[PDB]
Amino acid sequence: MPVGSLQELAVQKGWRLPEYTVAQFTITCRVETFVETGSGTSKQVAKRVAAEKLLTKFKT
Amino acid sequence: MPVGSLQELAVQKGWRLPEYTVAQESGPPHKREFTITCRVETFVETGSGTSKQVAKRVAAEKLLTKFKT
RNA sequence: GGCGCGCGCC
RNA sequence: GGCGCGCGCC
């Protein structure tokens, strides 16, 4: 999973664990110096999308 | 909403409602795959996915696509 | 939500 | 023990 993978990355890198804001659906994810917001039809999807976005901005 | 669109088609056409059946269940507990068969009127299609819900949606979409054909 | 069956990282 | 994720059933 993107969330699981994001976590493992942080733990691996020695970064403080990812932080997700309370779902509002949009959820903002922050890890290291990254900040990405995800949207979706459910809170679960928003979180997943925020994670995927962060990993993507990480690869670039 | 494929499942819903297919049901409406059937009702509008005067067909008995679509019937969905689990044709196959496989894979390890954490990565299962399901296959569902969708039968309506004279059509029969199969759909697969990570969950029974998803497989059902796929089976319905395929049947509608076969219907337009 | 409960029950159950699993997996990843630490 | 902790964090996370997946599926079924109710």
Burial class (CB in 10 A: 0-12, 13-18, 19+), B67: middle
Query: Which residues does strand C reach (CB under 7 angstroms)?
Result: A 4, 7-8, 11-12; B 28-30
Contact (CB, 8 A) for A3 and A51: yes
Q: Which nucleotide is nearest to A1 (CA to C1')?
A: D5
- Per-domain residue ranges for chain B? 1-69
Give the residue ranges with Cβ < 7 A from strand D.
Answer: A 1, 3-4, 7, 17, 44, 47-48; B 29-32, 34, 50-53
Give the resolution to one decimal, in Å: 1.9
Q: Which helix (H) or strand (E) holds B9?
A: helix B2-13
Partners of A30 in beta bridges: A19, A35
The whole-angstrom separation of Cα A55 and Cα A36 is 10
Instruction: Using alpha carbons, select from A47, A48, A37 the residue that is nearest to residue A1.
Output: A48
CATH of the domain spanning B1-69: 3.30.160.20
Which bases along strand C come within 7 Å of a protein CB atom? 4-10
Separation CA A32–CA A9 (nearest Å): 11
Select from 3.40.50.300, 3.20.20.10, 3.40.640.10, 3.30.160.20 the CATH code of A1-60.
Answer: 3.30.160.20
Q: Which residues pair with B40 in a beta bridge?
A: B43
Amino acid identity, position A4: G
Own/partner pairs, B15-21, CB within 8 angstroms, 24+ separation: B15/B40, B15/B41, B16/B40, B16/B41, B18/B60, B18/B63, B20/B56, B20/B59
